[PDB]
Amino acid sequence: ETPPRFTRTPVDQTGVSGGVASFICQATGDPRPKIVWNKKGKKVSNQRFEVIEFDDGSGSVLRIQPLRTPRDEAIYECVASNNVGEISVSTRLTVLREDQIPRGFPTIDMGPQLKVVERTRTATMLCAASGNPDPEITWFKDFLPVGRIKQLRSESIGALQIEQSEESDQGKYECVATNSAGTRYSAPANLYVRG
Amino acid sequence: ETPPRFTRTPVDQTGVSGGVASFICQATGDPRPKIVWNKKGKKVSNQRFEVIEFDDGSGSVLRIQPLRTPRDEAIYECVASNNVGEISVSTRLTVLREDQIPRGFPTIDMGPQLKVVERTRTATMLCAASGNPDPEITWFKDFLPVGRIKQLRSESIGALQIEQSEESDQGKYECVATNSAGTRYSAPANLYVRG
Ligand SMILES: [Cl-]
Numbered sequence A, B: 001e002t003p004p005r006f007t008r009t010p011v012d013q014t015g016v017s018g019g020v021a022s023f024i025c026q027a028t029g030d031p032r033p034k035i036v037w038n039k040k041g042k043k044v045s046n047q048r049f050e051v052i053e054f055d056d057g058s059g060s061v062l063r064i065q066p067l068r069t070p071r072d073e074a075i076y077e078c079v080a081s082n083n084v085g086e087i088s089v090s091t092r093l094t095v096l097r098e099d100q101i102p103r104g105f106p107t108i109d110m111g112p113q114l115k116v117v118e119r120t121r122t123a124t125m126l127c128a129a130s131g132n133p134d135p136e137i138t139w140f141k142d143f144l145p146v147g148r149i150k151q152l153r154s155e156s157i158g159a160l161q162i163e164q165s166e167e168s169d170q171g172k173y174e175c176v177a178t179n180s181a182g183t184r185y186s187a188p189a190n191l192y193v194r195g
């Protein structure tokens, strides 16, 4: 048996009021660890906060939507535990009002759209984002971070190219643009895969 | 006094199941005419059908959402009337299943997004659409067709550039792509104008 250790730790995020923020945490160990999210040592419990498990519960995403300020601004902790030990890591959420966001904060200029693809064909979700510094584009599916699937960029356009689409690819996709100023989400877009 | 005549008549549309179709009708006359929409001589009444007045009731849009097939496929009539006379014009709705749409039917590759703009500054809503033939991009605001406001194109990108934003510009915008095969709507995007 071995105590938990983190394989991914959450990083500080600065979001915008009305938007989304997500924190990602993953751990390994024997027994396999499970994760809870706390604030000031108490388990999070809020109508606008959702925890989404992955990796049989050894991965977790804390998603906050819609963001409120100052309500949601705090230090949060990801706590990984098994019967051998417990470890935590902290992270900070900042939430700006739309009238407080700096010049340069990411914008989603155009976002992904509803798509129905025939099974085994390629589906490409598209996003255009800008900011200063130029933002990184990442993708979420059903509230979780996403050779068959490629993340492409060209200038402001990001593409999530899903080759050989299969039933498991169906779900709700979001484009996320991040730079040193903060994070902005696109509206969600459903992908359906038809037989 | 003069009987109604049409200044805009609706045109046939081919939409996709789950999407939107809109028909536009406008008339003039003395007294000012008012419009009703019929099918087979009966006033439309359906949970998914909305009629939106403009021009003090002498303009009207019939909006159907979400489209169903064969349910919604029919000939419809715009009927303009005043105390001097009544005139009607007919139009057809076709609704394709997503598994029946032809190669070339318009796609909204990326669509407009939520935007908050400071009053008097420019807001630009963006859309990317493709098809064969290359589709025309039009814009709707609060379910109605939209020098201060410019409709721009560059390759697949359409921009609705709203200069000198004012409170009346706030609302729900949709990009619409149309070619000889049919019509596809973007997801809607809200514009807010803050003081
Ligand atoms: Cl994170």
Ligand SMILES: [Cl-]
Pocket: B009, B010, B011, B012, B022, B023, B024, B025
């Ligand atoms: Cl029309």
